[PDB]
Design a protein around this ligand. Structure first.
Ligand SMILES: Nc1nc2c(ncn2[C@@H]2O[C@H](COP(=O)(O)OP(=O)(O)NP(=O)(O)O)[C@@H](O)[C@H]2O)c(=O)[nH]1
Ligand SMILES: [Mg+2]
Length: 160
């Protein structure tokens, strides 16, 4: 089956591992254990096609070389994580040496009322980048499948 190397990037505490754990193991880790690094494999069906997801859950600032699609995560209650997104995208473009790397902008923790980055602010950023924007919550699983599957679909269009 076709294998997809997905990389989850973003500032610390935004919910990178929470999103990955929820996708892979279907439960919410609410104890914050900062990730030195982690790497996960899961076989899924997206749009009827079977594939193997190879997911690297990175730390918040080689893995950029490997990945085929990038999940760039900020928390909607963390203004600096949203501002940090621009650094990650430029870092991805530098090592990929391309303006067209498959990636998805993810606004996590949408369950929280403590919002400082509003939905239209992030939608604007993703529009300039030419990538999709998904609001997610690792706590309630809203958008989690949508975020990773959209990244896989972005890779698909990019590959064809
Ligand atoms: N309310 C809420 N809390 C969340 C959500 N996602 C993650 N958290 C919480 O956010 C904290 C950090 O989560 P974690 O997944 O470790 O974040 P990270 O972005 O992987 N951290 P790191 O960069 O250190 O490796 C934990 O308390 C986690 O339970 C969410 O959608 N909603
Ligand atoms: Mg982590």
């Amino acid at each position: 089956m076709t294998e997809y190397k997905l990389v989850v990037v973003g500032a610390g505490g935004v919910g990178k591992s929470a999103l990955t754990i929820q996708l892979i193991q279907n439960h919410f880790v609410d104890e914050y254990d900062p990730t030195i690094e982690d790497s996960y494999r899961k076989q899924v069906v997206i749009d009827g096609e079977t594939c193997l997801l190879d997911i690297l859950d990175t730390a918040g600032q080689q893995y950029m070389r490997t990945g085929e699609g990038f999940l760039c995560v900020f928390a909607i209650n963390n203004t600096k994580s949203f501002e940090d997104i621009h650094h990650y995208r430029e870092q991805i473009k530098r090592v990929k040496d391309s303006e067209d790397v498959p990636m998805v902008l993810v606004g996590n923790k949408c369950d929280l009322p403590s919002r400082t980055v509003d939905t239209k602010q992030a939608q604007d950023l993703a529009r300039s980048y030419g990538i999709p924007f998904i609001e997610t919550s690792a706590k309630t699983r809203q958008g989690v499948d949508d975020a990773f599957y959209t990244l896989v679909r972005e890779i698909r269009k990019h590959k064809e």
